[PDB]
Symmetry: C3
Subunit: 363 residues, 3 copies
């Protein structure tokens, strides 16, 4: 019977704290510097309260429905309040309780991304309703499909740290909501906290302190740097000079782009993905809700590029046996399409339920 | 002879840095946003200088007096400047030097809690005198009694991370002192740093990256979330709406409440303790010194509830052999009573000595 | 063949993230609170973009030239884009990829120290040119000479975490540049982030979570505290009262001073080095570019004192076999002299090349 490795337990608990740091206070500060001053306090309150709500829903039934064994779309209700999970139960090479906390931290940042941007325009009670509906019917099934042995995983979709589950998923929810900077030092500080926490997000996705965690770590450093330079170069070419917001946006573009690819590509691949993501991000915003443009565009770019750069010939770890680059690409595209439609439909349902119960627009 | 486990060494060094982060700059920013603007610089200076003083006193004689073998109340002077502690000496499953640093970080946050709140009203030299007296005669003996094999531990008191040693101890010292918000984004940032650092505080209290550290980690996430919701719900019911300060206070209430219980209870217990702590905290402040109301009330609530929720039947790790819930409860109450009187008496002595030497009230 | 230790892999990846945290956002916030308000945005942009540039240069050829085998001054070009480094290659007791990231993080903070201070006065394109020249011809060779088996290491120079490679190297580059506070809460926050990240910087320099990492950790706590008190005492004696900037400067003085010594001295040595560094730092500034006075003076003081306190008789780990204190002192002095001249010459070349190509002074 599988035994827990204390080095992996230590690494994973610290990586979980780093991911939690991305929301509290990372994302809150990022949006806090971007949105109007008069709306900052309310947004910080909404991010904090919804963060709490996600943590509770996760332990009550979220983890069980996302990671329990069930079908292609949902898990089960056998792990309600973590019932039936022995304290010494092992998942991979770490205690399952750590896996519960790590996975929960990803649900939290995904929700923080959406709430932080929409807090300005949405009624408090309406956001709570939306979070409950969307976490339960979008985040949970998509996590199950991708990381819980569901539909996408069973077709061999590659998404190391959440290009689909986190980025595209949140970007679409934010964009559906949108359809329905007073402090740049604060934006920079939030970006910096997101970047440092992202090492736990990306490297921790290996589930162990091995060579894949090391690869994801280095690729995170490289893609982020390449994206900062790509964005800044585009900014200098199009606007005549770099800007602080541009530099921070480029960092996020690279972080998002490398998210699905970090544990599968070589450093050359990380550099290319970083540059392309930084430029795509800049193109995206050119064509606080702009954040959904960066997470959306860059998440799609990253997910597609994972299907290319995972190739051995391109310095990647290699595709699964019997899988051509062409096949992996189709699988990546299908995963992206499914995430977009699934998240969009659920988000629409969430916003509509809130609007029909308490009303959407801030009173 | 006991050998050090490198995974535990790594986990404990990182947890120590996280606890140090709680003081520098966590607590300083929390108070920095709460106190009057004109007093911020002075308070930050006092927190930094007293933090330095604690670090030095700890290494010179503090660690030895708190953790050396002695009697029910004090250790000894055999580890002055860490003399006689071999570099390769092991304490538990980690090098003793790491145990020295981890334990020292708890002394630092306890003192930061007191200094941050009272800096506005106390003379610089008077706070230095108070810190010396109170750390030496209150923090050290209480740490020894609870975690150094002293009186309370010998009676089987349960206090995983310091409901008594840190929270009640500091709350009473602060309240004795009191008897004798200009920047809410800053308060939120300090709260967030305290929360992230608290994973090192709570999970690191296991002394190893095992299933107890994992349990404490998950319970920290759960109790904090439950407290945020409990406080916010009470706020909505009593005031008509949540507030950012309420959300941050609820987070601290849950963190404090779960501190003594985190490594002994089940997640159901963590949820209940979190909700009760959040509500008790709100009731407490209703009836910057208010922080002592939260740490005091919530520390007491947490310490008492540990004596209930540690029970196997309630999902806890179970009480010691031959100990009924009733017995544990009496032991918890006795530990609380002793901490309150001990800290109160020493604090009074400390403030009086400062007042008789240099004068208390800021000149 | 050497195998990777997962505990060391975990510790080193987390220490690397902590070092990265020192630059992003540590150093940026430290300078951000010190420099004029009108120059803050530009400085934050320059620190971020140059951080990205360093990350990319490091992976493309930097790591290979600094850590590959070559001669007394430079490595080689056999590790371009990390080519020829197997994903599972081990360096010491960790995967080589982690060693690449850890080493890269030191290059980043060294450059951040220089850019943050000079951003106010230098043209954007001129700083990029300077960084390329100076990282390539000063940071890389000095790192190779000290930590890559080059000239200084081959003569037994002691420099645990970079008194020469980082501190003196950057201080001289900054001073050559100089020759050619609006937000103290922000300065305090940057200092706090630098301090917490410094545990990864100092303890991670052991390359493993062993007793030397524990020693460096404790010495970091002690020297920092002793320096804060030494500076503050001098400030009280010379100016009549402590100040927040003084307390933060004292912390940095102790951190810099203990950098070369942390893994070689006893806690008594750390206390003495801390006090002397805090006082030397205060004397230095008395006689944002003042930061180069602290890193320069304190780096020299630390490097010299390592040659004294590494002695067994003084509680240190002991000098190499057959090396007297007198010999080690000469070696420390020679290493300091070489670092100063090497960095100064290259910096002058860098600034001149930029001035001849795009012009130095901000347009």
């Amino acid at each position: 019977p599988a035994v827990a490795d204390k080095a992996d337990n230590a690494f994973m608990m610290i990586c979980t704290a780093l991911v939690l740091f991305m929301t509290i206070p990372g994302i809150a500060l990022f949006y806090g510097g971007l949105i109007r001053g008069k709306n900052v306090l309310s947004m910080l309150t909404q991010v904090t309260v919804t963060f709490a709500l996600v943590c509770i829903l996760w332990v009550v039934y979220g983890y069980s429905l996302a990671f329990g064994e069930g079908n292609n779309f949902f898990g089960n209700i056998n792990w309600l309040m973590l019932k039936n999970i022995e304290l010494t139960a092992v998942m991979g090479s770490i205690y399952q309780y750590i896996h519960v906390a790590f996975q929960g931290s990803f649900a939290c940042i995904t929700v923080g991304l959406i709430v932080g941007a929409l807090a300005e325009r949405i009624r408090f009670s309406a956001v709570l309703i939306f979070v409950v509906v969307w976490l339960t019917l979008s985040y949970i099934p998509i996590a199950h499909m991708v990381w819980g042995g569901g539909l996408l995983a069973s077709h061999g979709a590659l998404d190391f740290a959440g290009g689909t589950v986190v980025h595209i998923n949140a970007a679409i929810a934010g964009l559906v909501g949108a359809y329905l900077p007073h402090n740049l030092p604060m934006v920079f500080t939030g970006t910096a906290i997101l970047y440092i926490g992202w090492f736990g997000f990306n490297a921790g996705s290996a589930g162990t302190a091995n060579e894949i965690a090391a690869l994801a770590f280095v690729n995170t450093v490289v893609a982020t740097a390449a994206a900062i330079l790509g964005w800044i170069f585009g900014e200098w070419a199009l606007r005549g000079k770099p800007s602080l917001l541009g530099a921070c946006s480029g960092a996020i573009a690279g972080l998002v782009g490398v998210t699905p690819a970090c544990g599968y590509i070589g450093v050359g691949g990380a550099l290319i993905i970083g540059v392309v993501a930084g430029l795509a991000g800049l193109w995206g915003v050119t064509m606080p809700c702009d954040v959904f443009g960066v997470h959306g565009v860059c998440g799609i770019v990253g997910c597609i590029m994972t299907g290319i750069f995972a190739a051995s010939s391109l310095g990647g770890v290699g595709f699964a046996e019997g899988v051509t680059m062409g096949h992996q690409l189709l699988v990546q595209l299908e995963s992206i399409a499914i995430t977009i439609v699934w998240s969009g439909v659920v988000a629409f349902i969430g916003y509509k339920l809130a609007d029909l119960t308490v009303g959407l627009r801030v009173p």
